[PDB]
């Protein structure tokens, strides 16, 4: 279930990235003319959503690397089981 969970997380992160990039562009437009504004309460929305888009990109990259490690490892483990059975039947 590890690979399935990782793929679900990759899909979630991709959707979040798309939404945050759209919001960053909308904030760019609104600058020329809610609480997603970074440390504003504690322009700012544009920077916060650019940061969030970059963070989601990094998350997608890391999750994809983990997913590929898991995919390779599953192939290797499956082959190990198959060949172990074959050897024991040799």
């Amino acid at each position: 279930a590890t690979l399935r969970e990782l793929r679900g997380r990759i899909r979630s992160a991709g959707s979040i990235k798309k939404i945050t990039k759209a919001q960053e562009l909308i904030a760019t437009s609104r600058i020329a003319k809610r609480g997603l504004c970074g440390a504003y309460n504690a322009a700012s929305r544009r920077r916060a959503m650019k940061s969030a888009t970059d963070n989601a990109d990094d998350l997608i990259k890391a999750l994809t690397l983990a997913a590929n490690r898991e995919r390779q490892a599953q192939i290797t483990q499956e082959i190990s089981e198959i060949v172990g059975g074959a050897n024991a039947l040799a």
């Binding site: 279930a1 590890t2 089981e81 172990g84 059975g85 024991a88 039947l89």
Partner: protein, 137 residues
């Protein structure tokens, strides 16, 4: 889990062909034959009973491993315990959403069945709503 490991060790030493995670083919049969001897006897046989409480240790909350899958498919329900719930103060750390008893109200006295008929479903819906409404203003 430890008994399954011991049986796997024995089978591999007898050079019986291995399967998933190198377990022998009949590991599910080992546990199912064990756990079907827990029974509620007919009144003709004396009405005695044996209640089984098997314990399974998972790793990294991976209930999709071979032996956990086997035993879950054998028993009359399960109480899933989770370290995240434990550390949060939910003790016993029972994950209500996925824990279940396959006997249900028949295993309860009438008063309990009356006051708790929908408690598990209510708590499952509550957890769903708490997750969904986490960032709703």
């Amino acid at each position: 889990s430890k008994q399954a490991d011991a049986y796997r060790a024995i089978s591999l030493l007898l050079r019986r062909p291995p399967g998933r995670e190198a377990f022998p083919g009949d590991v599910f049969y080992l546990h199912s034959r064990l756990l079907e001897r827990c029974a509620k006897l007919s009144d003709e046989l004396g009405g005695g009973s044996m209640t089984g409480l098997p314990i399974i240790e998972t790793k990294a909350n991976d209930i999709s491993a071979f032996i956990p899958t086997n035993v879950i498919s054998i028993t009359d329900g399960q109480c899933f315990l989770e370290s995240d719930l434990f550390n949060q103060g939910v003790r016993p750390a029972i994950n209500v959403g996925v824990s279940v008893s396959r006997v249900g109200g028949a295993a309860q006295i009438k008063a309990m069945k009356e006051v708790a008929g929908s408690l598990r479903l209510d708590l499952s819906q509550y957890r769903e709503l708490e997750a969904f409404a986490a960032f709703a203003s």
